[PDB]
């Protein structure tokens, strides 16, 4: 546990750490595969780019120093960690092994920034944050087995259907090659596949939403052909798309992630979508109209008219649900378009402009859309004081920008 001086350390020389980010985990990934080559088979070995990882790195950090302090919020956090690592299967006695290489990495990138006091620091709170998360992740892990058609680790599934939606998305119908009973999932929840790729003789893990309501036998997985021309294409997607057919088998995680309505609650609801289409967007919409009645409202970010069918089936759910708000907005509406009919507001997401209609006491947000997106909409709740457990983001489905 963290001494208040250790804390004060941590906070003082984030800014460096964060710095250093993109640096940092180049030099981890190097050391860690050459002692630990196995560890290829559960990180992503896709370049990214540089921009964005360091981006993302950043925020990582900036996040753990802001909520340091605060149990509650750091906790909310952190569980959304622990259901990417359930979903990955981390297990606990991979994190020494992180952990040597990660602390040899920020001595060797910070150089003469690293001092005894800072590396120590530093090294208390990777032991901190892996403690927490090893017994979130056993908690998930257990909740699963016991759950009816629940498993730990990978079950072989079968690919029953293929099913082409467009010229980049296809669907994958999946049923257990066991035949038995599969655990149920909430909207918004997404399972891992694990598959071997062939270009790089490693296995790669993925994750997609479960699609549709669960039916207790099957599942189903909306996949949207990626990269290509000036980006490389994507490994795991195309291999799906021109490599593994009906009959074929792959390995799956039970359903996993925080991300989901509470079925349970009866405080309000506000969604906040920034491109998200009827994918698997409908579905969650169903769950959040149920019985009886809980306040909702519904924030749809689009670009115009010429794609307006998430558009029209809000209309159609604002229409006959009563305790249900719709706000659109438009970042370049069309000529045609006309500000009170055609839409509401002009340009992204602006909660500033709808205060008084998401302010709602107890309530809980749910934000999905483009990464940007979700990150830019987390960061303006915070400013409104809206806790971090109260906020709830995660890619949800087969095309960010959809509408
Ligand atoms: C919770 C969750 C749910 C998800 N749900 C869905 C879903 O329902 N449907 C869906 O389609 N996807 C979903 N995804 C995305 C999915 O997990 C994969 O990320 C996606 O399929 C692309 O994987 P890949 O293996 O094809 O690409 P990767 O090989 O991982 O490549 C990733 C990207 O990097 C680009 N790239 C590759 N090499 C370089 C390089 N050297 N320099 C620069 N750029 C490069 C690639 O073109 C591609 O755009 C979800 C992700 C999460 C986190
Ligand atoms: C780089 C120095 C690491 C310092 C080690 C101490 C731990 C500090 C970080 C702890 C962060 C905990 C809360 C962060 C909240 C959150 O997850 O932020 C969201 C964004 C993303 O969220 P979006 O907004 O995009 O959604 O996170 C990132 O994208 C991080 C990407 C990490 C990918 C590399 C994984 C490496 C894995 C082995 C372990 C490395 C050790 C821990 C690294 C932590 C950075
Ligand atoms: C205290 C230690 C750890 C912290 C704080 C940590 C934190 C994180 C964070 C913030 C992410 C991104 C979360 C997201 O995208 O939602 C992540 C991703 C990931 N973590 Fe953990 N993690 C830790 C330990 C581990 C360990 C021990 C392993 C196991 C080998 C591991 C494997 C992964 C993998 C594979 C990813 C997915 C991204 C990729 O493929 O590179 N993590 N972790
Ligand atoms: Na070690």
Redesign the pocket.
């Given at each position: 546990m963290l001494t208040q001086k250790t804390k004060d350390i941590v906070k003082a020389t984030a800014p460096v750490l964060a710095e250093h980010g993109y640096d940092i985990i180049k030099c981890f990934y190097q050391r860690m595969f050459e002692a630990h080559p196995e560890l290829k088979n559960v990180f992503?070995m896709?370049?990214?780019?540089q921009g964005q990882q360091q981006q993302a790195l950043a925020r990582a950090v900036y996040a753990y120093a802001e909520n340091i302090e605060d149990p509650n919020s750091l906790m909310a956090v952190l569980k959304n960690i622990a259901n990417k690592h359930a979903s990955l299967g981390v297990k606990p006695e991979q994190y020494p092994i992180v952990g040597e290489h990660l602390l040899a990495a920020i001595k060797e990138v910070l150089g003469n920034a690293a001092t005894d006091d800072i590396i120590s620091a530093w090294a208390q709170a990777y032991g901190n944050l892996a403690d927490v998360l090893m017994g979130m992740e056993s908690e998930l892990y257990e909740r699963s087995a016991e759950q009816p058609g629940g498993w730990k680790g990978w079950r072989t599934f079968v690919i029953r259907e293929k099913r082409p939606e467009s010229d980049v998305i296809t669907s994958f119908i999946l049923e257990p090659a066991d035949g038995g009973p599969v655990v149920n999932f909430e909207p918004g929840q997404?399972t891992s596949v694990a598959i071997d790729v062939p270009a790089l003789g490693l296995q790669?893990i993925?994750?997609?939403?479960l699609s549709d309501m669960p039916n207790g036998r099957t599942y189903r997985?909306?996949?949207?052909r990626?990269?290509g021309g000036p980006?490389?294409?994507?490994?795991?997607?195309?291999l799906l798309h021109d490599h593994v057919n009906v009959g074929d088998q792959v390995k799956l995680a039970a359903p996993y992630?925080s991300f989901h309505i509470d079925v349970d609650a009866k405080t309000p609801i506000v969604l906040i979508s920034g491109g998200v289409g009827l994918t698997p967007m409908v579905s969650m919409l169903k769950v959040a109209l149920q019985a009886p009645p809980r306040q909702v409202v519904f924030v749809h970010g689009a670009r115009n008219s010429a794609v307006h069918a998430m558009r029209d089936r809000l209309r159609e759910a604002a229409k006959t649900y009563e305790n249900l708000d719709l706000f659109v907005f438009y970042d370049q509406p069309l000529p045609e378009d006309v500000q009170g009919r055609d839409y509401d507001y002009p340009g992204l997401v602006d909660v500033k402009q709808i205060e008084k209609s998401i302010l709602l006491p107890d309530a809980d947000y749910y934000i999905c859309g483009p990464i940007p997106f979700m990150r830019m909409q987390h960061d303006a709740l915070k400013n409104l004081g809206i806790h971090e457990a109260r906020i709830h983001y995660?890619?949800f489905?087969?095309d960010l920008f959809a509408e």
């Open positions: 992503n896709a370049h990214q780019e997404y790669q993925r994750q997609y939403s997985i909306s996949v949207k990626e990269g980006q490389p294409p994507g490994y795991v997607s195309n992630g995660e890619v489905g087969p």
